[PDB]
Amino acid sequence: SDSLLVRTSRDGDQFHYLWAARRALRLLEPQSTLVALTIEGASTTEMGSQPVVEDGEELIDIAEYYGSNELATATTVRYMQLKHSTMHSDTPFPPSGLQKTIEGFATRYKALIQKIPVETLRTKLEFWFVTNRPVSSSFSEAINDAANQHVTRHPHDLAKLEKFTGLQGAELSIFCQLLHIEGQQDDLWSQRNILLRESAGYLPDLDTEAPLKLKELVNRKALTESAANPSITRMDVLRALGVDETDLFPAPC
Amino acid sequence: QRNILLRESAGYLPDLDTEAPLKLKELVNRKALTESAANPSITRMDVLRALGVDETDLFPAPCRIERIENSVSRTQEATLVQRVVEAFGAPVIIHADAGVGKSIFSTHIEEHLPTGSVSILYDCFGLGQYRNASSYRHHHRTALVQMANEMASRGLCHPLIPNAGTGISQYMRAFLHRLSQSISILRASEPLAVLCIIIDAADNAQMAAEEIGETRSFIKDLIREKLPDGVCLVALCRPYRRELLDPPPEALT
Amino acid sequence: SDSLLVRTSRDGDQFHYLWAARRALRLLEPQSTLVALTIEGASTTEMGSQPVVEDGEELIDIA
Amino acid sequence: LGQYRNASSYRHHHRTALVQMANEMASRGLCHPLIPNAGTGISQYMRAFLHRLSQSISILRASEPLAVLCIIIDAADNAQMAAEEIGETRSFIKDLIREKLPDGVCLVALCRPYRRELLDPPPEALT
Amino acid sequence: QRNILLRESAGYLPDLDTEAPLKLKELVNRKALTESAANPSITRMDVLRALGVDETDLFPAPC
Ligand SMILES: Nc1ncnc2c1ncn2[C@@H]1O[C@H](COP(=O)(O)OP(=O)(O)OP(=O)(O)O)[C@@H](O)[C@H]1O
Ligand SMILES: [Mg+2]
């Protein structure tokens, strides 16, 4: 049927919002260095006052910034891309799938390398691929051996990786040093309740409205009305739960 | 659209609420995934379990007064009922001691009203189960909900469905608001219809309240409240327990 | 930009769900004749036990 | 073990005792599990408990027609002493002893002779 | 009667208590047709995570 292919489009957004909402909790840690999440777009303050780099921007599902909301002085920055295939959860992906993501990652990499030198960016920058399904092991081995400068056992997968990246030698190696693969995630039916279990640790009791409210916050960052500012900060999470800083320190010494 | 839903949903509840517009939207959204493709329907039970109540919460205390077939000719009652309607603007209390026929008369009174009239009958005694924790009958949040949904079932006004944490003044205002709608409906089709409220066994409720440590059963507040024009209120008790429900000086005995 | 045309796709679903949720309240009326809402597809019991008509089905937002 | 007067270890509220007994029958396969909710009143707990008594005895007597279900409350007076020591008046047993149970279940309590009137039996009770 | 439990429309506590009967059936059905995983068995930890509770929520006061 046709309606099946329309319904299967919504489950991907549900997976995306739940998985981002589980990440958003880390802003509450009092002795941790994370500072910002941006949903469907990089930070508008990424180059400070200077205009933003638009290359490879549309693969950005989630971006995470540590230390500063600005690539020139942040300690670490992550850009992440997600995939939720519904009906084939046990079946490994081929490299012809990861091609379409690797292309855009290299496109963003080139424009970032032009403005800031490699010896800085190689300490900061990561690209992640996150998916429900397992991923081809030999392709990962080729990625590893490229990143470590060893003769791989699978030259066809390395040739495919070269075709996808358009790079060879150590310039390929550096790029493969920034590429992270994370398969075999818990599916939607599990993700829907893991969030409840993790959110129950900050509260004094079990709760059943907080997993709704964090998801609603993440969803309302993904509309057109919030396009001027896609950021999430600690104050946003606290006013989503409905408290302010005085409730955490009601009676000072 | 995001706030019109709040305004329309606030009419069925006794107070303003800010979680119901989320929950109905979540219900509709979860009907639009693949997991519910076997059944895309929405029914009344789905909406009620989305709000978190069931049919027992709309009818928490049904009537139980025994009707009888034999009825000896007994001349006073036809005068005593017109004595009520011709002495409007004040609460009326009937009293007589044990086994004289108050509860039977409460079933007969309805036949003598002017045409077009409607009467609501409430039972505070049950069958001696009113003193048990699973069968209390004396709170506002039971009797007022009972009477509101009995009028709504007959087609006079909107339903009133309970919400946790709601105080006594909100239930009083929600009840008094719907009395006016019902009396407008009655006095459209006929000029002289009345709406009559009968509280049988009014003295048991205050005994049950005082036994568990409370002091204000619902009839102890309702008797001094002022009802809209065209509404009658009658209470029946034994003669020596009459001071528990403490009538105002303007009352009729 | 391209991302504008992706973001504008979500607002339509938000409008759809809010507008359907306003319709769903009418099921609570004690003296009204409405019996069912079906979201993105007609009722599977539309022809009783007989198989369902599939023509023109995908324009059905709400039934 | 003498902990029942410390704030983190109370045992005399409905939402502790009835949840314990319901899940102890449910773990054995006789009824659905009962899990608590914040903001629920005591009458809802009473009705939800009686429902699962009705489930359990119907499971049992379909295989042995003269079987019974026994519910035992040890140290019944201590629950009322702990309640009155902090300003309440109705521990769970003081309500449960006057409630009407389904057929095929029996209810037994144990106490010291000089403390018996704390839990105030009705005239039908057997001693 | 000796073997099958069924939901009535009444008696259950609101919210999380209502859907445990459905989620046990869902867990069993999910496990039977996810034989491609490392193992299809059910153990206590998966039951507790299916219900959403912790053991101390079921047993707040042991004997
Ligand atoms: N009109 C009647 N015709 C026949 N029998 C009647 C009539 N009214 C009362 N009785 C008899 O009197 C009995 C007592 O009636 P009823 O229960 O109404 O009394 P009551 O005054 O409400 O009692 P109580 O004060 O004890 O609550 C009835 O059960 C019935 O046997
Ligand atoms: Mg009587």
Side-chain angles (χ1 to χ4, degrees):
Chain A
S1 66
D2 297 336
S3 60
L4 174 63
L5 307 184
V6 191
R7 274 161 181 251
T8 191
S9 76
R10 264 81 71 91
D11 304 18
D13 303 68
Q14 289 298 301
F15 185 96
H16 173 202
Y17 303 154
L18 282 165
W19 197 95
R22 296 174 63 215
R23 301 294 293 192
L25 287 173
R26 284 281 181 51
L27 296 170
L28 303 188
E29 300 300 326
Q31 290 283 353
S32 183
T33 51
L34 164 41
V35 167
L37 272 66
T38 88
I39 273 54
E40 317 226 334
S43 177
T44 59
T45 59
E46 177 192 354
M47 299 294 181
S49 58
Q50 307 303 279
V52 183
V53 172
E54 311 305 7
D55 291 339
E57 180 77 7
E58 293 73 23
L59 300 188
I60 295 207
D61 283 298
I62 311 164
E64 296 181 329
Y65 298 82
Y66 289 71
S68 303
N69 63 357
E70 178 188 60
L71 178 62
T73 88
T75 278
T76 50
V77 178
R78 299 192 180 99
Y79 306 111
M80 321 195 297
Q81 175 84 113
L82 276 62
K83 291 198 73 177
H84 179 237
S85 181
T86 293
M87 71 176 258
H88 297 295
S89 63
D90 65 346
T91 300
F93 280 141
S96 50
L98 276 64
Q99 174 174 355
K100 189 159 55 73
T101 299
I102 286 170
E103 284 271 43
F105 283 161
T107 302
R108 182 45 151 269
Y109 166 93
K110 287 174 181 186
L112 300 182
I113 288 284
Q114 286 185 2
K115 292 183 185 291
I116 298 175
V118 199
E119 280 50 57
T120 292
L121 296 176
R122 189 168 63 239
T123 70
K124 303 194 181 201
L125 177 57
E126 306 179 345
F127 303 100
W128 288 44
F129 176 85
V130 180
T131 188
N132 184 27
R133 284 168 69 172
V135 178
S136 289
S137 61
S138 62
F139 187 68
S140 307
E141 292 180 302
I143 288 164
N144 173 86
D145 296 346
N148 286 266
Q149 293 285 16
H150 296 89
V151 180
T152 199
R153 287 165 280 121
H154 319 295
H156 296 292
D157 290 350
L158 184 59
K160 282 183 176 181
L161 179 64
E162 287 177 28
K163 182 183 177 178
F164 305 159
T165 53
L167 297 167
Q168 278 95 1
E171 292 167 20
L172 180 66
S173 193
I174 288 164
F175 177 78
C176 296
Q177 285 171 352
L178 314 186
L179 180 63
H180 293 227
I181 310 301
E182 290 293 346
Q184 307 178 331
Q185 293 295 272
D186 307 80
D187 62 351
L188 182 63
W189 187 90
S190 309
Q191 293 289 347
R192 205 190 281 300
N193 234 45
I194 294 160
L195 178 63
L196 188 156
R197 303 300 330 151
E198 321 306 310
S199 56
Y202 304 84
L203 304 180
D205 72 333
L206 87 175
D207 195 293
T208 53
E209 278 74 39
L212 293 176
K213 292 187 174 185
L214 294 176
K215 193 174 71 170
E216 186 69 0
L217 170 65
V218 174
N219 172 245
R220 288 194 69 179
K221 295 298 179 182
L223 303 189
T224 69
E225 81 196 300
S226 147
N229 190 345
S231 313
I232 305 176
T233 67
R234 187 164 79 96
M235 202 85 208
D236 282 291
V237 181
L238 294 183
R239 293 196 295 213
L241 300 178
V243 310
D244 73 88
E245 183 47 290
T246 317
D247 282 12
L248 277 66
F249 298 98
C253 185
Chain B
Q1 293 289 346
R2 205 190 281 300
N3 234 45
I4 294 160
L5 178 63
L6 188 156
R7 303 300 330 151
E8 321 306 310
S9 56
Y12 304 84
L13 304 180
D15 72 333
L16 88 175
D17 195 293
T18 53
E19 277 74 39
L22 293 176
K23 292 187 174 185
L24 294 176
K25 192 174 72 170
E26 186 69 359
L27 170 65
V28 174
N29 172 245
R30 288 194 69 178
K31 294 285 167 173
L33 302 189
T34 70
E35 81 196 300
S36 147
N39 190 345
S41 313
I42 305 176
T43 67
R44 187 164 79 96
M45 201 85 208
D46 282 291
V47 181
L48 294 183
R49 293 196 295 213
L51 300 178
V53 310
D54 73 88
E55 183 47 290
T56 317
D57 282 12
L58 277 66
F59 298 98
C63 185
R64 212 74 79 177
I65 294 167
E66 181 206 310
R67 310 305 177 94
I68 66 172
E69 294 298 332
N70 309 128
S71 186
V72 75
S73 181
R74 178 157 171 73
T75 189
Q76 194 192 346
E77 69 183 39
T79 76
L80 194 67
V81 61
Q82 67 185 141
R83 193 66 168 86
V84 176
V85 53
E86 295 301 327
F88 55 54
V92 186
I93 302 181
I94 320 299
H95 69 80
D97 60 3
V100 177
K102 299 181 296 295
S103 317
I104 302 304
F105 168 52
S106 80
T107 70
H108 283 43
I109 164 175
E110 63 93 19
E111 81 186 3
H112 300 127
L113 295 175
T115 194
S117 304
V118 172
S119 69
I120 283 70
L121 173 67
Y122 190 77
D123 169 13
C124 304
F125 176 72
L127 294 172
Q129 310 306 296
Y130 77 98
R131 298 177 75 225
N132 305 351
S134 63
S135 300
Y136 295 152
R137 286 182 171 249
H138 63 83
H139 301 119
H140 305 69
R141 70 177 182 259
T142 293
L144 303 180
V145 175
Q146 271 291 152
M147 293 164 120
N149 291 326
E150 288 163 50
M151 301 156 148
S153 176
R154 206 174 293 210
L156 296 169
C157 68
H158 304 282
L160 175 59
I161 71 182
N163 195 358
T166 303
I168 78 184
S169 301
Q170 288 84 43
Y171 286 110
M172 271 295 188
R173 285 190 289 254
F175 181 71
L176 259 56
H177 180 216
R178 292 164 207 251
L179 299 176
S180 304
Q181 297 163 55
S182 302
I183 190 62
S184 302
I185 294 293
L186 301 180
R187 293 193 172 198
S189 318
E190 284 84 10
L192 296 177
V194 298
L195 182 61
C196 185
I197 297 160
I198 305 299
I199 307 299
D200 196 16
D203 44 2
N204 284 121
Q206 187 61 20
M207 301 185 28
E210 292 174 12
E211 171 96 350
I212 74 172
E214 297 185 25
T215 58
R216 302 291 290 211
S217 66
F218 81 102
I219 188 58
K220 196 164 170 68
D221 300 330
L222 186 65
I223 198 164
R224 286 192 181 242
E225 194 54 276
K226 182 173 290 188
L227 304 187
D229 202 353
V231 183
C232 301
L233 178 72
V234 185
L236 297 96
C237 76
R238 289 185 179 178
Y240 60 109
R241 294 178 182 163
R242 192 195 67 180
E243 304 310 285
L244 300 184
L245 56 68
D246 193 8
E250 301 86 299
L252 200 181
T253 301
Chain C
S1 66
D2 297 337
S3 60
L4 174 63
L5 307 184
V6 191
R7 274 161 181 251
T8 191
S9 76
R10 274 91 181 261
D11 304 18
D13 303 68
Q14 289 298 301
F15 185 96
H16 173 202
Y17 303 154
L18 282 165
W19 198 94
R22 296 174 63 215
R23 301 294 293 192
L25 287 173
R26 284 281 181 51
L27 296 170
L28 303 188
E29 300 300 326
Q31 290 284 353
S32 183
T33 51
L34 164 41
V35 167
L37 272 66
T38 88
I39 273 54
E40 316 226 335
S43 177
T44 59
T45 59
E46 177 192 355
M47 299 294 182
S49 59
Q50 307 304 280
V52 183
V53 172
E54 311 305 7
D55 291 338
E57 180 78 7
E58 293 73 23
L59 300 188
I60 295 207
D61 283 298
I62 311 165
Chain D
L1 294 170
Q3 306 306 303
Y4 79 106
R5 291 167 79 227
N6 308 347
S8 64
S9 302
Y10 295 155
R11 294 188 172 231
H12 64 81
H13 293 130
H14 308 66
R15 67 182 184 267
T16 300
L18 309 190
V19 175
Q20 270 291 153
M21 293 180 337
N23 291 323
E24 281 216 90
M25 301 176 288
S27 179
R28 212 163 295 192
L30 305 180
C31 66
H32 287 288
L34 173 62
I35 80 194
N37 178 62
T40 292
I42 73 185
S43 301
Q44 293 122 46
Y45 283 107
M46 267 288 165
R47 291 187 289 254
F49 187 66
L50 268 52
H51 173 241
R52 300 185 198 205
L53 296 176
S54 309
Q55 287 185 349
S56 301
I57 191 59
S58 304
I59 299 296
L60 301 173
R61 285 194 167 201
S63 60
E64 283 85 7
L66 271 43
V68 292
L69 184 74
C70 191
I71 294 187
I72 304 181
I73 305 302
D74 193 12
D77 47 22
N78 287 336
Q80 185 62 22
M81 290 170 45
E84 295 177 24
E85 192 255 319
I86 70 170
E88 271 145 359
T89 64
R90 305 296 291 207
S91 67
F92 77 99
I93 184 59
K94 191 165 164 69
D95 299 336
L96 182 64
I97 198 167
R98 287 198 180 239
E99 194 54 271
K100 180 172 290 188
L101 307 184
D103 203 359
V105 305
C106 64
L107 180 64
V108 188
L110 303 100
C111 58
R112 288 185 179 179
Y114 58 102
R115 288 179 177 162
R116 188 186 67 225
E117 302 308 309
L118 287 177
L119 56 67
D120 193 4
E124 297 98 305
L126 183 149
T127 302
Chain E
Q1 302 192 17
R2 193 176 297 138
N3 293 284
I4 272 59
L5 284 163
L6 280 161
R7 324 191 60 221
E8 287 77 42
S9 302
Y12 290 80
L13 288 188
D15 195 3
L16 207 69
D17 173 287
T18 64
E19 61 285 40
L22 179 149
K23 297 204 73 179
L24 293 166
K25 184 202 181 203
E26 284 274 21
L27 178 67
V28 171
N29 176 289
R30 171 183 169 86
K31 288 287 188 180
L33 289 301
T34 314
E35 74 303 321
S36 189
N39 189 275
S41 67
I42 307 170
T43 67
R44 195 183 85 121
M45 192 76 267
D46 282 4
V47 185
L48 294 182
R49 253 201 310 290
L51 297 176
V53 298
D54 168 353
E55 201 256 340
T56 65
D57 308 331
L58 297 189
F59 304 108
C63 179

